[PDB]
């Protein structure tokens, strides 16, 4: 009898959750293909193994 | 294929256009407060002031 | 190109995407009697027996000349120097015309 | 936990995020900057650093004549970042 506040609260929390999922997807998924470094590690002296 | 003496250089190009959808505004709504709660009623409006 | 949309705006971004790439052997610079030549605007590539100076975003191979390469330093500090000749359009003409 | 609250898992786990980051690192190490603007074209890292120096107005001959010094400084900075960081993550901890 108090109304439909609970539906609004559930909707807001669900929206926040999907927002965070899409947010991390936007931040990290910037490329369409997966690249891998070649097995031999030589770049003129730069040490990327760290 | 990476090496310290190998470079890849394009010999052709493709021009492609893409969309970018961006909302800039929403519906300008404005609801007054006194009529929404009380409603055309002086007796109820007297408990709102 | 902007386009109006209901309660929003739409852009048609015209971009330039390269395509049809092919491998080329490169080199940081070229040598001439202990005088390195670096590319003024471009990159050195190879066809198997001789080198060229093409731009970075397109294949426009050009014969290496002093016009499009600037001299800097000797041929000892830089690693990966390859031996090739450049074209100087001053010597053969003077030799022929005396 | 047991009063009406739950925590959903993220859409992509930490392994997948690390795989994305590794792919991006490999792309920017091998291809340079072109892997984000079309097909990825390989280029030796010294030449990529020569192009990146040319961006800030410093000519290419500066890098090659002292490439070893550049490599040593880069290695020193990357190795010292762990000491500088592990001894902070304030903006990540305050959210949690
Ligand atoms: C660069 O690519 C374009 C296509 O993106 C090529 O254009 C084609 O050229 C062939 C030539 O035999 C034609 O039969 C096609 O109809 C063309 N297609 C289009 C869409 O115009 C172009 O030839 C390529 N250039 C080089 C030098 O390879
Ligand atoms: C690489 O580029 C050269 C430059 O045009 C192509 O033509 C060669 O040019 C040299 C000098 O002018 C000649 O000695 C060669 O005989 C030319 N090549 C042929 C096949 O005749 C060359 O064709 C290109 N490709 C290769 C694999 O060298
Ligand atoms: C490229 O050029 C350099 C310099 O001319 C060559 O190095 C010389 O090679 C000759 C070969 O008999 C030696 O006698 C000299 O002592 C070398 N040094 C100098 C300073 O002349 C080099 O061999 C050439 N070829 C390559 C692949 O580097
Ligand atoms: C790196 O360059 C050296 C000589 O410049 C060559 O012997 C070596 O094979 C190169 N590395 C790769 C992975 O091709
Ligand atoms: C580039 O592609 C050609 C064509 O397949 C191949 O023969 C060559 O080994 C590749 N790599 C280089 C450095 O040319």
From Swiss-Prot, chain A:
Function according to Swiss-Prot or TrEMBL = Precursor of the fusion protein processed in the biosynthesis of the S protein and the formation of virus particle. Mediates fusion of the virion and cellular membranes by functioning as a class I viral fusion protein. Contains two viral fusion peptides that are unmasked after cleavage. The S2/S2' cleavage occurs during virus entry at the cell membrane by host TMPRSS2 or during endocytosis by host CSTL.
Q: Which domain of life is it from?
A: Viruses
Q: Which residues are glycosylated?
A: 47
Naturally occurring in which organism (per UniProt)? Severe acute respiratory syndrome coronavirus 2 (2019-nCoV)
State the protein's name: Spike protein S2
